[PDB]
Amino acid sequence: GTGYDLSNSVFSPDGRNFQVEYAVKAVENGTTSIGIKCNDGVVFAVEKLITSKLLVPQKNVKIQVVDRHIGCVYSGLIPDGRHLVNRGREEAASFKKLYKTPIPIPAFADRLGQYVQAHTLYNSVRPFGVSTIFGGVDKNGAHLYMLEPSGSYWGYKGAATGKGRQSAKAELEKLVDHHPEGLSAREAVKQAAKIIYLAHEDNKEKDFELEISWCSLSETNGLHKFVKGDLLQEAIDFAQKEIN
Amino acid sequence: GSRRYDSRTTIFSPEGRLYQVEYALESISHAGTAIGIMASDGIVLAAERKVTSTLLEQDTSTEKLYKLNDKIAVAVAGLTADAEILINTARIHAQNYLKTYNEDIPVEILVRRLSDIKQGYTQHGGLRPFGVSFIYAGYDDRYGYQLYTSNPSGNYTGWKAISVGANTSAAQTLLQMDYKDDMKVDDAIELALKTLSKTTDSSALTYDRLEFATIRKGANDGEVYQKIFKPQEIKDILVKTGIT
Amino acid sequence: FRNNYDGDTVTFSPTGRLFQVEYALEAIKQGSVTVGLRSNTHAVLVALKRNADELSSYQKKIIKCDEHMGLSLAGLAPDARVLSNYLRQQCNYSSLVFNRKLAVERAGHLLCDKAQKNTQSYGGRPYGVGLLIIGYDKSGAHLLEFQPSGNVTELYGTAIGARSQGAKTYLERTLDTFIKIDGNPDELIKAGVEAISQSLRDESLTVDNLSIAIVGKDTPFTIYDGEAVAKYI
Amino acid sequence: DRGVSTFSPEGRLFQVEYSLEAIKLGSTAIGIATKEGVVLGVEKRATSPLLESDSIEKIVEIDRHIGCAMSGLTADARSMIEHARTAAVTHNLYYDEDINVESLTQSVCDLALRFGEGASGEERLMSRPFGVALLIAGHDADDGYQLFHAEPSGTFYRYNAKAIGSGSEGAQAELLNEWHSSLTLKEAELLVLKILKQVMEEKLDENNAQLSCITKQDGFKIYDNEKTAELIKELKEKEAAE
Amino acid sequence: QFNPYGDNGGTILGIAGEDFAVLAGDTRNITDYSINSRYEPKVFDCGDNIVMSANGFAADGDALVKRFKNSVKWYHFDHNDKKLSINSAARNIQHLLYGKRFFPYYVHTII
Amino acid sequence: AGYDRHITIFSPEGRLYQVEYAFKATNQTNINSLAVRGKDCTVVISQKKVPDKLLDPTTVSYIFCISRTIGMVVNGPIPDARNAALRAKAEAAEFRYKYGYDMPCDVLAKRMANLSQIYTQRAYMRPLGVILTFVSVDEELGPSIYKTDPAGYYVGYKATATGPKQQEITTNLENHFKKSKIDHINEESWEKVVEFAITHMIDALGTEFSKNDLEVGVATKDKFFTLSAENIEERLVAIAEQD
Amino acid sequence: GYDRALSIFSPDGHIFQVEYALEAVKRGTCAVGVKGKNCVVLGCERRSTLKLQDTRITPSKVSKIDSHVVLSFSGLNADSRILIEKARVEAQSHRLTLEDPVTVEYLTRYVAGVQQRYTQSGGVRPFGVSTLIAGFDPRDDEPKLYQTEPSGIYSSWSAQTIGRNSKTVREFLEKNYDRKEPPATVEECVKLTVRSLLEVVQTGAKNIEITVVKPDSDIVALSSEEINQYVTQIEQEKQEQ
Amino acid sequence: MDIILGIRVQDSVILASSKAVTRGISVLKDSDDKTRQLSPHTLMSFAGEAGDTVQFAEYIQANIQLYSIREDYELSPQAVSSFVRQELAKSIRSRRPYQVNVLIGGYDKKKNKPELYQIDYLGTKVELPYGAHGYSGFYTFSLLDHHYRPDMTTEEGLDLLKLCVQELEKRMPMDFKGVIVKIVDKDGIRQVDDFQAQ
Amino acid sequence: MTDRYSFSLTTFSPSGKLGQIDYALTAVKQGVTSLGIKATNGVVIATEKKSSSPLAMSETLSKVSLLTPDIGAVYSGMGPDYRVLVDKSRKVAHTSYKRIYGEYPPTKLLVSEVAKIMQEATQSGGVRPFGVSLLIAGHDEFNGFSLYQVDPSGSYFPWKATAIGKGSVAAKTFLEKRWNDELELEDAIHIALLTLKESVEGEFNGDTIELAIIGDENPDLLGYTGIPTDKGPRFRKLTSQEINDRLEAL
Structure with missing residues (x-):
């Protein structure tokens, strides 16, 4: 029959979970955001659509930090994103309190994974309307991740989601081939700025604001920090230049 | 949500009837017939075993007559x-009463309690009612011999003679035809067998398809005695009453 | 379509929409207009109070959350009472425990998170009211727009409610002008009334009909109604 | 089926709207607020001549300075009245003073939206909205005499005069023209007695209608039948007078 | 064993004039034979023209004053900025204190 | 009425469609796996497919180390797979704490099967779209393979396969054992068992594998471990010098 | 756990579960109560779908809540028991804390509250019952008669009826009961009650039971004969014309 | 403690209870009736801890009256006493036990015989011809053990009690301000308003 | 989260049928045949080990389970449902009886316990009935040997011999022909093997059949000696070899 797509934890005859898939539609309808793993860190960047001149510039920050070494950015229903970071934060505090050492990125990823996977087990809840790219530096390296509303996640070299995910993925794949040795944090920041600018074409109708953050063993001491001032403008320019 | 799958077992029909109770009663009408006849010197309970086989162990069987109290x-x-x-809770209530007042529980008090429990499944909880109807045969020192009946709705009433289950209409008419206030246990025993004998949906009425019990006050004693007839005992009384 | 996916907030439509949330947003549009704008020294709230009969009062639309914070509502009044009450507690908590005044940006995050919970679980309903929060904290004057979806944005000015679009375009135009009305509340307030009258149509703002509130540098969030707003009509 | 706290595509709560409909079917209630007191009148509307009219209680006292009238599913108003009485008395115990009429009203309206099958916001254990609107009238030092209309929506409006129930649209139109900032208590009385008579199916007499008021001096009082009958006679005379 | 109470010393005085009132208190805070501070205010302005002091065990005195000030704040929030008359503040404080009838605020309070 | 296909209640034919559709989900990853028992080891092979070039191949796996001695390979969506892995680990650790010895492979299986049986009976819990294959070298039973499905069913195997082309692998293995007449790969080194495993994987699926097309897990006395791309390559080379 | 809203509003402002609860009352056996100048009488009809009952033990229609107050009803029997028990319990609690038995209005307002409550609580259906409550306030001689219904609404009546064919009998009472001169006798009050039931019972000496309540806990139920005697004297009133 | 005495004669049970209520240094009342009628043919006397005493008595009264209404029947004395014993036996192991001792005197209309039950606060119950609580038994039991006869008339019971009260008023250190006497028989419970000098 | 299914999933239809019970019974019907026969000095229960694959190890899956040292069970229907029912039965024999009386429960009472567990899955909120029918055989001092059947409704009845599942109708008929009240345990085992053959399509040997008996005490299966009153379990599963020996005299 039909109706398999009205309740959240129901398996359709072909083994799918339609509500999780409809959740994805909410994600694809959102702003584009990416992540780039470099030789000793990771960079996050996102597109911020300037609805009007009334939005105070630089104020509505979207990227979020978890603990002191993890960055998270997402596309879709913003509120759902925050909800997930809040849990991530409790998840990280709990881990540090018991084990003393700040939470490893792989461990943190599964914490977010199990939580999201949990929201696809009952019809009393709705799946998350966001895909999340997060990562940081830990005891052994840098790690980048993307988490889908299904709770599925994998480690990435580069990642993108949202409106212009295809352009982004395309640009990302180029970098992967032309740099088997590894991109530097400094470079990744610029490259990132470009990818957002490019991918912004799939939304070229509205003006936007660029936002970047990074976590590099050498550039930030392994702590997640936002890219501001000079380093920011320098990347904006590098983009504005290669956009023509 | 879950609401979607809720049958709503406790609501009124536009006519002010309780669906579930009505359907449960319908269920009961296909159950083996049970008769209750109250005499001046005792009470008779007889029931027809629904479905039987050559291999069914009858000596160890009991599917219609249960002892609640002595x-x-x-x-x-x-x-x-x-x-x-329901029987088990009825047994516990009887003992609670005994332990509290150091007196056996008056027959109506136990029946009203069991009926109240049934009434509950009728007004709250969202659960199906019990597909059961009871004929209560008991004795106490305030009303002596008593015969009651309770059904899924939680209603109960007193009778001189009554039946529950299949063909009650036919059974009730036959009882109302030959019952007489001054009857005697032996008379009632015979009436009961004749009634079942004419309402059976089976070929003949044999002992292997019956359960029998009497509550008498054995003259040579002064106390009340319950007697759940044994296979052979039923077989005997079945010949004597002229049914062979 | 829609009809099969709008029976509760816990259901996504085939396109990724949340109708219950959207239907809630509709309650705001049906609400009376209210405006908010700020310079670098002050923040102002101008709200059009709506009356039932001519024998009825004009329902209050501005609520003070603390001495440095407050908001204006558009939509279900009860839901603003709940949300503002929660904002009052959060401000109170910050003070009592950390002896710190709650950052307007932090209040925004708290409202977003409270609204979000009511859009992901079975049984509840989204809040059916929009809020404009203004306040002066350790980083100056601020204005926030809260949507039941859980989306909160910081702006220089804005408006919500019926015909709100009028005032919003006016402000998006007058921007460079009012953003510099520093050290002169009266000028900021007048600019607020001029933006709000850009959404009139029915009548004209009267004395028992206009409601204004201001906060800033050396001005604790205070509310003006009636006679007190006469000098602005 | 569908949630009890679901939004219509227009941004309204079904149960609350449907609730307002039951209210329209209730007996008429009217309130007039003057600088000399607030009057509250209702239509008894007994369903049979054997029903003893005075056992119809649609006007009750909250506290000496607050009283109220109801219209709609009157049985739903009992827990509301109780909550109100408790709120006013509690306030007095905690602050050694009278509860402001607005505050008392706001308290009652807080119960309003506390319904659902598990709404994430607290523990609103109540299956449906109330099916009755209330006219709460009283007096207090800060805002003098006051009249409030509390609805199952949780919102409450202040009025100079207001009518709820079956003849409200009609009666309200009347009040619109009759009310003025200088009415005397006696005027308001006749005025309420008059409008009730216009919208009532039955011929208004001191048995199928009841008046009451609240004044700073004597507080809330329910006019006994004899007192009202005279006021009724006085109305007929002033009407036949032109 | 742990003793949840202590004595910070101090003395306070309240006198009501015909159309004025004063509430005074020394500013010395002690512990046994040591002085903790030669200046630690103990009489506070709580708004609505009400001054209060809870002398005795300072931690308790502070909590009480802090709790009452917050009470005044909400009084305004819940009763359209109505002023809290001193007689009403008094009944309010009685309830604040009686709420801990079985683990009292070890203070002598005056407003 | 038609909802007897949304939750786990019986259909007029006595069926539980939700459990059936859950079985369907297990093939969603289009991955095949197989397990065989050695003389004193247990091997599990599973195809590894990494489509996206943006993925970090090292983080893509359907094999899990449940305990020092138990390994588990999952056929089905990764999120449900990871939910099953965590639970199994928690369960394995608690068992040791309470009973003082390592949880046996078959017992862990039964426990996971029962948990599944429950989602099959309680309406608020959906089944997990996965098939769990547990392996180890039990201290009492020797090399062990126990598998569980969304129906809450489980049993031990001499060898087994799971996935879209399950049937082909199965008949392939069945044939080999009808021939050998023994219930295990009579080899002393796990390396050779791993080779036998991969070899028959190829024969049955009719495909060639590079070092990044497979994923291997081995269980020996007191330890279960997964092989590296290089440990595998060494395996692929050995089998190459035979064909 | 079960808290589904079974009693909710429909578009036209109705609550069908309460409405349908009334339908169950219409189906119940008729009940009537009339107050004299110094007493109150409660009459109830006895069904006849089945007859071979044991009248001694079968539950009677009029129940005593306390020694000075009785309660009759029309509707679901199983449901009435719940109300009766709660009413009896509240009667003792009241005596225990106020040191005085309940007034009839109080006891009535209590029962009504329980009913109202069941119309807006999750997981429960309203009571399919309507009641008539009569008696005399402690130390008072003025008779009291009240009626309650599923919705939770209640009020007092000079005389009232509920149940099947109550429409008929109410009419009888409306044109046979003068508030100016209420049945000044226990006798003429019981007669008016029997007369009202005969309009619908259709010759039922064993189908009509009456209970008389006088001041100071004086309550008694008539026997078949006593009642049958009233019927007889009434059929003559007709024939003698 | 107060004086709680009971005697079961041929056709009735007689209960005598002191009228004094002393609180520390003063006798606040000298007309206290330490009894509660549980049903028309059952009376209960009690003595013990200040507040517990009446609260318990009234609590029991409430329950019996409720049973009487529900069943339109009067529980036998034996039944009412087992109910009471159980209530105390529960209380003895609760957070704050009822410190109350009682005598239950009733006339069993079915058996047509009077019955006297003694139950202390622990839930210890015994049936006796006569009994008491506290120190009372110490002064009176030798008198009752001597003069008691199963066929005594109510009048003989009152004379035997009077003797007991006199012994109590002679050797007991406290002034219990006399006793209130009540008779329970086939016709109910009545109070002997004349014992201040019978 | 939180199970919000607090209402019954099995309710009465207008006809008076209880749908889910019926469907559950239908599931039982599709299940492999199983049977039980009572002899004068023992009881035998047996079923077919329908190996779902040749790679599967049929021994690692017992359809015949020991509930107490004198009681065993077998079924027809949904295997997973049976497995958990056995766990719950073994535990209830302890919690509701052995931990109270210091001895194992008599067959009728344990059966009664199981039945209760099943009845609840027929009325409790948020669940479906168990899709199985069990045949429980046991022995106890005061009742001797017995055999019971428990269906999804929770109903149970004593049998001299009976069968459930796929070919229950045919098998029950064949049993009615060979059963008498003078059968010795070996005779019942024989009759059991014959009955089971008619229900088996393929191989029929001690590796495809599972059979247990409730008979004499097996002191050799006690595990210890020294306590006269402890003689050993009466329940005993037959070995592959033991079955084949009897199949030759088929």
């Missing part, structure tokens, strides 16, 4: 398993 027994018509749940 002074109260019931005849069951409906889901055996549901009856057993």
